[PDB]
Write a structure and sequence with these properties.
This is part of a larger assembly, with eight protein chains of eight kinds.
Chain B: H1 16-22, E1 32-37, H2 46-55, E2 64-67, H3 70-78, E3 83-87, E4 104-105, E5 111-112
Antiparallel strand pairs in B: 1-2, 1-3, 4-5
Chain C: H1 5-8, H2 13-28, H3 37-42
Chain E: E1 26-32, H1 35-51, E2 71-77, H2 82-94
Antiparallel strand pairs in E: 1-2
Classes of the chains: A mainly beta (52), B alpha+beta (115), C mainly alpha (51), D mainly beta (109), E alpha+beta (108), F alpha+beta (95), G mainly alpha (37), H alpha+beta (324).
The structure holds magnesium ion (MG) (13 copies) and zinc ion.
One magnesium ion (MG) binds next to loops of chain D.
Chain D binds three RNA strands through strand 1, strand 3, strand 7 and strand 8.
RNA sequence: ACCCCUAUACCUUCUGCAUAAUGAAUUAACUAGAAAUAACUUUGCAAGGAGAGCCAAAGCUAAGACCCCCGAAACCAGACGA
RNA sequence: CCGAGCCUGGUGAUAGCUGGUUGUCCAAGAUGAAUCUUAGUUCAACUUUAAAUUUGCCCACAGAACCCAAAUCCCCUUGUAAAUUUAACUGUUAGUCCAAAGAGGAACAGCUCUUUGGACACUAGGAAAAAACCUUGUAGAGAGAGUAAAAAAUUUAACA
RNA sequence: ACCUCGGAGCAGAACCCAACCUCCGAGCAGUACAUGCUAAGACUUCACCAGUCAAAGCGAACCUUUGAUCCAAUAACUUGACCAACGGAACAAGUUACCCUAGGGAUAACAGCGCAAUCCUAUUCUAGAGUCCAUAUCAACAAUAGGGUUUACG
């Protein structure tokens, strides 16, 4: 199945957004737009929110 | 289902035999209908009831004068089974203001300016 | 039919508009009736007598 | 043994018949599949509903149908037609009513 | 709309067909030592067919057999007239380039 | 609700209404859309935008809320920096 | 009862009157031809 | 019910049982061409358009073609896709041969005929040329539909045309400030002897373009008329205003249009100079104002509407306090 | 007076009751619509009203109008009873 | 009068259930959703009152899809006078039969469902008596008159 | 067995239309991570709740179905459990002929009344049997009438 995970900005901002990734898949690192920084930055998976 | 009925146009195309039978000339057709309600609107569809109310034929056997124009004719076609239509005949022309109060509608359909 | 549909188009527009103007005037003229001092004072007559 | 089938109707269809005055953004017709195609000044949503892109009068017409070449299935369907055949579809247009603005005198410098 | 004169103006499925003595199904077998020659003759015969308006269904090939190899090709044909068949096969006979094998065998 | 309280004889307010609805003085009731904080991960951006909005109530819903609250909640409040100060009154309203 | 029935369904009296009024009326071939020369 | 079609239903002529024997659209482009043809064809149903609507010379040409074919170098350049064309020579040849027809198309598209002659058309037979001398070294030409600034059009232009009298007129089809239909003339030379223009009769002196600021883009027309025999004719807007329609009505007997050339003029500081220095009036400034956005009649209870509903109908953004 | 002609008690409950559904022998007496929020109407005063508090972007104050009767089997507390 | 005594009190228990609910007269007034819900209720629709101002219904032409009939929708005119909105609001809201298109049942049911329309729950005349078929409605008095619907029809086997 | 949602027919042509009605399907996945933010005007499953579409604008770039509130958890952004009886009691089954009350003919059984599938009777046809022989007698497939005695149905 898929799991909802919290991608946290690697830009130091407190910004986080939730994505969906397969449980068997590797931990996620993704470019995403950081509103506070106003620039695309890396986000790293921190913790699993739930299993869906 | 029961619905409004669309009357085919050929129904309202008079033939020479009809012209002879009823005494109306297709050229120079009559201007005004005299319409009387001779049938109840009860047990008839609400749309026929509404058409009768529009035409002002709530009272039966009370003649009403209407224009012989296509829209009035469309309504009259809708409710033709509840009414009697006869042309309004004016042997002395339409009444003048002087004799507007001395007219009478003869049962033949003639508005005579003397009574 | 005496007139064709195109001939009848609009021949009664003026009269119909005036009739609806009359209806609108009646509808918008609705308002409480006047009140007269005479009506109020005439009630004193309930105790009118002969002296 | 037959379950389901209790879904209600979607209340789809034309919302503005021909001649109806339509303001920008008004939905003209909602359809499940492309019964009516967007014409001039008529947009299409995700769900294939037709909405007016300008303020005007709605008109329905029949026009030759030439699909987007990237529409592979439609292109193949056309490829299988005989030489004289031309596909047709019903299109919805909004005939814009007002001009898109006027020049006004502001200051007599 | 159904009641309008323009009813059915958009129908096309009737314009799409998805599915006097005349031949049956004709198979032309071309076994040739040359891939190039076999392909060229297949193209030539197909061009003759589609120029003469002959219904051609398939132009496949048989699997190779080794016992050097001979490449095999098939041409499917349907629809011939009396004189048309004569002209067709006489042209085929006269236009065979070099050491190729024709056939007018039938299906199955 | 309680039309006559047992201690004062007054009409009571349904505090469940006060916890959920804002009354604009003119007579309008504002509310949040139900589910605006629920399972946002499976809602499209348009649906989320619709859900994040402050929404007016029906006439009958407003009448119900008016009945369920007392006149204290239907007064003019001159708060310092009320975000709804401008919305507390209607303008250019014909009938 | 359904529109189609195994028995002949009873008509509305109005329909029955309509049928009676629109019954076929044969022509009278003048004076009785057999009695004629 | 079914009303029969009011004409030949499309795809009816070719409707045959011999579909397999019928040739098909092997390609998309041929279907596109056929569809465009049908779209152009008139139809009995409602359509989008209803609502949104010598021999020796030929022999010489063939011989020239054969000569170009014979030139092998030309074939090498063609097959190496390196050959080119003389643009000036092509321009001159097109002007002589069929340039008048294209210029008539351009005039019709720009609406000169409908606004100058109420739809009465003609053909610019004479390859007229106008150019406004910019500085001293160069002169910006005035083609059919060019774009020239009033700064460059400040001074009268140099006119050249291979012909033999002529009356040249300049009008501004849309510069009028009071009446929508009238127009202003800038300069009118009459009874031109042959080609030389300095000897023309200057009836109305020259004016530069004056398109008001923010009033869009104005189209200025150079008309040239063949003149059989001279006729005596006749900085104020009241006398620069007139209608070319009735003007040329008064002279069509001995005058006939034979040349045209028009251009688009925008605002420019020279326009301010024109409005102040010599027109001696305040310059008007125009702004393109769009109609106010439509909003449905405001309801007492905007059910399900966002809080912005009230802002859609409030006029003043500043807080108000009523009696307080 | 009757004879003539016309006329299928009442209430309630029902789609529909002469109904062979309910209730009623009959007389007298007794026996069943209580009130707010907001409106509307009529006064008073009016950017203010109100005899503190409350309301107020014509409001506020006062009045007028509007919310039934009988009936379980029960439950619990405390007595009284072998 | 014991599957849990009796009395008093809580207690005017509670009852979506049954019954009852008292002067005169006039007027308007009739068949979806959710619900531990279908014996009830809330919202809608309908309905009543008052108010505002301005179009409302009827409605021809034009118009509304391919796949694979009856009609409907929409609205210039026209006949008409109503409609919308604002304020306040109860009650009715899981009906009957008839005609018609269907489904289920057995091309049974005074059977059960959906749809269009009519009538009944409202007056009168008729079809024998008669909710639902037909005629007909707006109210009173008359010891006048013209009408509407409105009454079943049929009798039949020789043979060259 | 079913209870929520959706597709097709009933329901042919705007919308809408039931069922113990005839069939089918779903409780998500794939994708990307602007699949962002805002906002005119609209649609709407006949209420509400909820659910849809969307110009313009800003910002990056150059997507195709399920469930409320409260309550919890998280600094917050956000997230969860069931609520599938799928408008959702936070947590409660069997049984009563020992039963009780309030009612219900709006709802069963006997009975009455409809209906006549079933049942019964009579004719038509002769297949046919009847040693042959249709019709002394009997009788198949059927057809047409009648009855209201069974079993059922309302
Ligand atoms: Mg369905
Ligand atoms: Mg009784
Ligand atoms: Mg009872
Ligand atoms: Mg009794
Ligand atoms: Mg003892
Ligand atoms: Mg005892
Ligand atoms: Mg009680
Ligand atoms: Mg009444
Ligand atoms: Mg529940
Ligand atoms: Mg109940
Ligand atoms: Mg809705
Ligand atoms: Mg439940
Ligand atoms: Mg439920
Ligand atoms: Zn005889």
């Amino acid at each position: 199945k898929n799991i909802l995970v919290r991608m946290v900005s690697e830009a130091g901002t407190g910004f986080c957004f939730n994505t969906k990734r397969n449980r068997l898949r590797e931990k996620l690192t993704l470019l995403h737009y950081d509103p506070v920084v106003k620039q695309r930055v890396l986000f790293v998976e921190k913790k699993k929110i739930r299993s869906l | 289902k029961f619905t409004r009925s669309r009357i085919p146009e050929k129904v309202f195309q008079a033939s020479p035999e009809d012209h002879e039978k009823y005494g109306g000339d297709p050229q120079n057709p009559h201007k005004l209908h005299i319409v009387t309600r001779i049938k109840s609107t009860r047990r008839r569809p609400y749309w026929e009831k509404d058409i009768i109310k529009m035409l002002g034929l709530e009272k039966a056997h009370t003649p009403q004068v209407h224009k012989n124009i296509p829209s009035v004719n469309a309504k009259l076609k809708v409710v033709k089974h509840l009414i009697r239509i006869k042309p309004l005949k004016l042997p002395q022309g339409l009444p003048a203001e002087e004799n507007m109060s001395n007219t009478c509608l003869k049962s033949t359909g003639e508005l005579v300016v003397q009574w | 039919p005496y007139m064709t549909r195109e001939q009848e188009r609009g021949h009664a527009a003026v009269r119909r508009r005036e009739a609806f103007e009359a209806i609108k005037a009646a509808a918008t003229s609705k308002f409480p009736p006047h009140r007269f001092i005479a009506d109020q004072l005439d009630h004193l007559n309930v105790t009118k007598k002969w002296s | 043994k037959n379950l389901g089938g209790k879904s209600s109707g979607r209340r789809q269809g034309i919302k503005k018949m021909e001649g109806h005055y339509v303001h920008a953004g008004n939905i003209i017709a909602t359809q499940r599949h492309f019964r009516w195609h967007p014409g001039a000044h008529v947009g299409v949503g995700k769900n294939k509903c037709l909405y007016a892109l300008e303020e005007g009068i709605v008109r329905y017409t029949k026009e030759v149908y030439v699909p987007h070449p990237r529409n592979t299935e439609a292109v193949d369907l056309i490829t299988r037609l005989p030489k004289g055949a031309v596909l047709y579809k019903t299109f919805v247009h909004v005939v814009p009513a007002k001009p898109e603005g006027t020049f006004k005198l502001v200051a007599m410098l | 709309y159904k009641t309008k004169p323009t009813h059915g103006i958009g129908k096309y499925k009737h314009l799409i067909k998805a599915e006097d003595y005349e031949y049956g199904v004709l198979n032309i077998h071309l076994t040739a030592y040359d891939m190039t020659l076999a392909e060229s003759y297949a193209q030539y015969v197909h061009n003759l067919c589609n120029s003469l308006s002959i219904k051609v269904e398939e132009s496949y090939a048989m699997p190779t057999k080794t016992i050097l190899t001979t490449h095999e090709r098939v041409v499917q044909i349907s629809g011939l007239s009396a004189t048309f068949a004569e002209i067709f096969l006489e042209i085929i006979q006269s236009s065979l380039p070099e050491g190729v094998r024709l056939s007018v065998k039938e299906h199955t | 609700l309680t039309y006559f309280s047992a201690r004062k004889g007054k009409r009571k307010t349904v505090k469940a209404v006060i916890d959920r609805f804002l009354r604009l003085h003119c007579g309008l009731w504002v509310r949040r859309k139900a589910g605006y904080k629920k399972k946002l991960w499976k809602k499209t951006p348009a649906r989320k935008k619709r859900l994040r909005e402050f929404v007016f109530c029906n006439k009958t819903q407003s009448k119900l809320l008016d009945k369920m609250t007392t006149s204290f909640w239907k007064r003019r409040n001159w708060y310092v920096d009320d975000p709804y100060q401008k919305y507390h009154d209607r303008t250019n309203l014909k009938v | 009862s359904k529109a189609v029935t195994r028995h002949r369904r009873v008509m509305h009296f109005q329909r029955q009157k309509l049928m009676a009024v629109t019954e076929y009326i044969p022509p009278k071939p003048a004076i009785h031809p057999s009695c004629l020369p | 019910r079914r009303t029969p079609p009011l004409g030949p239903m499309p795809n009816s002529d070719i409707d045959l049982s011999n579909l397999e024997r019928l040739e098909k659209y092997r390609s998309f482009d041929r279907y596109r061409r056929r569809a465009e043809q049908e779209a152009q064809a008139p139809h009995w149903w409602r359509t989008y358009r209803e609502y949104f609507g010598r021999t020796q010379q030929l022999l010489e040409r063939k011989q020239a073609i054969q000569e170009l074919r014979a030139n092998v170098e030309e074939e090498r350049a063609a097959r190496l896709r390196t050959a080119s064309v003389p643009l000036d020579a092509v321009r001159a040849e097109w002007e002589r041969t069929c340039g008048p027809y294209h210029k008539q198309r351009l005039a019709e598209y720009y609406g000169l005929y409908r606004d100058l002659f109420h739809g009465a058309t003609f053909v610019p037979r004479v390859p007229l040329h106008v150019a406004y001398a910019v500085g001293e070294d160069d002169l910006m030409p005035v083609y059919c539909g060019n774009e020239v600034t009033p700064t460059e059009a400040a001074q009268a232009p140099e006119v050249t045309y291979e012909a033999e009298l002529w009356t040249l007129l300049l009008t501004s089809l849309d510069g009028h400030l009071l009446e929508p239909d009238a127009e202003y003339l800038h300069w009118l030379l009459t009874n031109i002897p042959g080609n030389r223009v300095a000897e023309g009769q200057v009836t109305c002196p020259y004016l530069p373009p004056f398109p008001a600021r923010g009033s869009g883009i104005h189209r200025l027309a150079f008309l040239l008329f063949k003149q059989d025999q001279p006729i005596d004719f006749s900085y104020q807007l009241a006398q620069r205003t007139f209608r070319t329609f009735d003007f040329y009505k008064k002279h069509q007997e001995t005058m006939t249009p034979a040349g045209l050339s028009f251009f688009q003029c925008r605002w420019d500081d020279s326009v301010t100079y024109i409005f102040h220095q010599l027109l001696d009036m305040r310059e008007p400034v125009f702004e393109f104002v769009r109609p106010p956005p439509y909003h449905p009649k405001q309801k007492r209870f905007p059910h399900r509407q966002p809080l912005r509903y009230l802002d859609r109908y409030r006029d003043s953004h500043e807080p108000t306090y009523g009696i307080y």
